[PDB]
Design a protein around this ligand. Structure first.
Ligand SMILES: *[C@@H]1O[C@H](CO[C@@H]2O[C@@H](C)[C@@H](O)[C@@H](O)[C@@H]2O)[C@@H](O[C@@H]2O[C@H](CO)[C@@H](O)[C@H](O)[C@H]2NC(C)=O)[C@H](O)[C@H]1NC(C)=O
Ligand SMILES: *[C@@H]1O[C@H](CO[C@@H]2O[C@@H](C)[C@@H](O)[C@@H](O)[C@@H]2O)[C@@H](O[C@@H]2O[C@H](CO)[C@@H](O)[C@H](O)[C@H]2NC(C)=O)[C@H](O)[C@H]1NC(C)=O
Ligand SMILES: *[C@@H]1O[C@H](CO[C@@H]2O[C@@H](C)[C@@H](O)[C@@H](O)[C@@H]2O)[C@@H](O[C@@H]2O[C@H](CO)[C@@H](O)[C@H](O)[C@H]2NC(C)=O)[C@H](O)[C@H]1NC(C)=O
Ligand SMILES: *[C@@H]1O[C@H](CO)[C@@H](O)[C@H](O)[C@H]1NC(C)=O
Lengths: 532, 528
């Protein structure tokens, strides 16, 4: 006595899933499918090995463990923090993926959406409530896949050139999952010839890196980059600085008691996973509000050059991408260490706090460059207005880290053969627990893309549910056709007209300029100065 | 004979002329010698006080114009010819002029001293737009103006040499100011109330007298119009001045010992030096200033910027301002694509080309920073926007931001500053409309030229001219232009007033965002 709809055979063996209820009807979920051998013991820091075939039926009936990661404790018990923290036990045995499909299974091959979570390459999990695929699959009849990938030291510690810790294995985790989709998604009714990757923040940077890595590029057809880009200043690190960071962590945990790499990694392997996590914060070169200790390394392998170079020199004919940002990208990060900031106050900073915030929000630039930032962002008719300083600091951090990297990628892709669509998400959710001064913070479009307002246990307003259904429709139209349009039209983004649309409760408004003036500073001038 | 027209000064007796204005007569003494003619062995040397004379000097007509290049870019065009010499060129040119009410005052009258502009290479006190008769009649002041040597004759420097020490044109101005102290009372002028006013290089001159202590005791108030001593074109270092002096010596067939070199230069006709003066500049530029004040530790003990930042300016009142479109006039003197006879709608390549020529000696890095700041990246190739942007580049770098930096430093360090922007386009203007209110075209209103019946200004423009004359003379009398009030300029509020036919409007910021680029960032970048 079984349900045939919940039984699927993949190349590795048989799976049994669970049937979820949604407001619109049932969907089939296969949660926690193993796609790699567990990377534990001698397998830690190594590239993932494909999951060996199994006999019997594996129950894919619940989310599996979260990969080991630092857990944020800035506002304990605060919904705005807790929603991003692991909702499963931490474990190095965490390489599992999730498939949601219509109930019953599609008769015709169905387009596939593949989600890559964010969290600065040091955190995140596919099991977070806000990444629940059931509403998207029910509303738009797609197949949705999400995977866990190793973060922090376990996914991106790199001793470049070494066999034992080559770096970027968290990206290879993603790639292995993408390879699993090509080989297996048709068993769930998905179309391996229509796969759209989507991600946010570090997930968006991951998506972009798969675009720029030929072995990944054959595994999908379309890409969505939400509030992140591979050319972001926090998303990559050079070979030498990666080695310095790996060596510093090893030194901090007593390894060895630099030297031979094989030996150093062997010492690192004897350390408890939690010990590495608790020391990862002490590795960074400068105090920062952003920077993350272990991120993808540009070592000539996964990425043959810097993403910026690969973007600038790329031929992108035959590609559709959808990119965008939230209205207030910088605000969320400032409450995480910038002087004068708190979610519990107005964070009306002084001029001196503004100056100190630029250094933390724009880490590792010269004084000369920091002076250029201050000049650019200061209103010299109101140089000391606290409210204006707070707003300017938010734009500094958001422009440098999210908006301008996105705009640069969008412009280069459009000019080099791809069709681009761009948005700014401008709705502040009625459920938002953050203060009003933060506006629409980083990450808070995700719940609308995934249709979370349709959850009966939540309290979104009726118009926000309509709004959520409109965005799910845009995303699914893009996955099926490469075009979010079906009514107000969404024009493509081009390097000249630079048109984008605003996403909020009102109909689409077409505007031009993704912070065009600001991003000319970050993308055209400051790069000149650096090499001088 | 008219007794009002005979004056004895320290050097002897003069005879002046009675002039007519629509408001009544005025006494004028034109072509008064204040120095020995700086000729032959005296060329390039500091001026010497005029030795006394017997008999009566005839002071009824303007004297010669000091030797200078004559602009030939639009021959016969009123816009260019109004600045060209209207008297014969001569090295025997150090004369000044005095206008007084008729009959001559018998109470000490405040004195205005005009220093003309012209990039330190040109200019004359005899130009029609500097006619002092209307200011003097309308506002009952004494007005003085002097000729000073320009070009090589006034500013060729072999620093350290006795023979060509540099800045002698500035010393010409100082001697005229010394002459005013010793003789102005004989005309009814008050030597304890002397206000200096100048435009462009004349304003830079005023600023340099403000920062040179031997000149500071010769006047009490200062007006700087479209110029500042910290302007990029206003000064030169000792090494570059020596290089320029040496290259002109080569160009006119003279040997590279300073004594030898200057002696050979002295044998060359004056016209010959003028004919080669442009060729000394290192790079091609819209500004032809080859010989300018030199920072040698003497007249200027430091750069004007260093002197400005360090000075105690309590007790000083100053009036500064700009025209609405400072850059447009300079663009037609060689910026690619520009002409008075077209709309000057330039390409982006021409805009970029024009930046290098309007900002003459900056690195590519700095130039790039300029084109980043002045590009609208939503309309990067719009010809009309590019034309206006390059006008802003040239005007901000050369006039507006040097003036704004001076005004802010002086206010923050004790001076009472009043700032204006002159926004009225003269109904008689011969330049095209796209130029707006160009550099130099506030002068005619402040000298009351619209009151001349033989000119075609409107009734409204004459009322306006009378307003400006009252502001300027109020400031000369009291250090305050007011009688809608004109508030002082401050480093914080940055308030200025708009001068046009409308009543005064108070605004904040002399291109504050643009000038933060020139006055705060770029200096940091150049050193690195
Ligand atoms: C760097 O060191 C590694 C490991 O050293 C070995 O580890 C010991 C436990 C034992 O295996 C010993 O042989 C060594 O001390 C080297 O890898 C070994 O290289 C030697 C041959 O030269 C030999 O042991 C095996 O080939 C390797 N054993 C492994 C992989 O554990 C490696 O060659 C050294 N590289 C250099 C030169 O820096
Ligand atoms: C606004 O608040 C921030 C943060 O204060 C936090 O929230 C408060 C309600 C309270 O719980 C504090 O303990 C929290 O730190 C202020 O920034 C801090 O100010 C304190 C003052 O003693 C200082 O000791 C800390 O170092 C500051 N932390 C920083 C700069 O990150 C800020 O000063 C407040 N601004 C105002 C006046 O509104
Ligand atoms: C607008 O006019 C400028 C300048 O043209 C000048 O005025 C004309 C009436 C005529 O007298 C020309 O000889 C003058 O040069 C133009 O710029 C020039 O364009 C010509 C080609 O037509 C070129 O050979 C010159 O080198 C250019 N000179 C400069 C200083 O750039 C400009 O092309 C005109 N633009 C228009 C009318 O759209
Ligand atoms: C939604 O609001 C209701 C109001 O009673 C509350 O009981 C419930 O806990 C809320 N659930 C949320 C905020 O998810």
């Amino acid at each position: 006595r079984e349900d045939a709809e919940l039984l699927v055979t993949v190349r590795g063996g048989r799976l049994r899933g669970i049937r979820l209820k949604t407001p619109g009807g049932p969907v089939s979920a296969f949660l926690g499918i193993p796609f790699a051998e567990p990377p534990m013991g001698p397998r830690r820091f190594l590239p993932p090995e494909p999951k060996q075939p199994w006999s019997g039926v594996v129950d894919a009936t619940t989310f599996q463990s979260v990969c080991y990661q630092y857990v944020d404790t800035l506002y304990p018990g605060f919904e705005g923090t807790e929603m991003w923290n692991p909702n499963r036990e931490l474990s190095e045995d965490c390489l599992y993926l999730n498939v949601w499909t219509p109930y019953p299974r599609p008769t015709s091959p169905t387009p596939v959406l593949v989600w890559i979570y964010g969290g600065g390459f040091y955190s995140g999990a596919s099991s977070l409530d806000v990444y629940d695929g059931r509403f998207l699959v029910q509303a738009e009849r797609t197949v949705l896949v999400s995977m866990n990938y190793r973060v922090g030291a376990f996914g991106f510690l790199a001793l470049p050139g070494s066999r034992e810790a080559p770096g970027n294995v968290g990206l290879l985790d993603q790639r292995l999952a993408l390879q699993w989709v090509q080989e297996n998604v048709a068993a769930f009714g998905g179309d391996p010839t229509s796969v759209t990757l989507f991600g946010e923040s570090a997930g968006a940077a991951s998506v972009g890196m798969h675009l720029l890595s030929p072995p990944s590029r054959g595994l999908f057809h379309r890409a969505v980059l939400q509030s992140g880009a591979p050319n972001g200043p926090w998303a990559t690190v050079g070979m030498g600085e990666a080695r310095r960071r790996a060596t510093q962590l090893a030194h901090l945990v007593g390894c060895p008691p630099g030297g031979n790499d094989t030996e150093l990694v062997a010492c690192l392997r004897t350390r408890p996973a939690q010990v590495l996590v608790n020391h990862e914060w002490h590795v960074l070169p400068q105090e920062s509000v952003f920077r993350f200790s272990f991120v993808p390394v540009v070592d000539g392998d996964f990425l043959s050059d810097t993403p910026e170079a690969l973007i600038n020199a790329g031929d992108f004919h035959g590609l559709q991408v959808l990119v965008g940002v939230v209205k207030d990208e910088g605000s969320y990060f400032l409450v995480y260490g910038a002087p004068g900031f708190s979610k519990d106050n107005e964070s009306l900073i002084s001029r001196a706090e503004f100056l100190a915030g630029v250094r933390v929000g724009v880490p590792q630039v010269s004084d000369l460059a920091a002076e250029a930032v201050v000049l650019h962002y200061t209103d010299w008719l109101h140089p000391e207005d606290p409210a204006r300083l707070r707003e300017a600091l938010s734009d500094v951090v958001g422009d440098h880290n999210v908006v301008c990297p996105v705009a640069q990628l969008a412009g280069r892709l459009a000019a080099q053969g791809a069709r681009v669509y761009a948005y700014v998400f401008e709705h502040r959710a009625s459920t938002l627990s953050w203060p009003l001064w933060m506006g629409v913070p980083h990450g808070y479009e995700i719940e609308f893309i995934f249709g979370i307002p349709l959850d009966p246990s939540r309290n979104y307003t009726a118009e926000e549910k309509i709004f959520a259904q409109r965005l799910m429709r845009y995303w699914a139209n893009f996955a099926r056709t490469g075009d979010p349009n079906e009514a107000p039209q969404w024009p493509p983004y081009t390097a000249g007209a630079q048109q984008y649309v605003s996403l909020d409760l009102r109909p689409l408004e077409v505007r031009r300029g993704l912070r065009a003036q600001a991003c000319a500073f970050w993308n055209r001038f400051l790069p000149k100065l650096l090499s001088a």
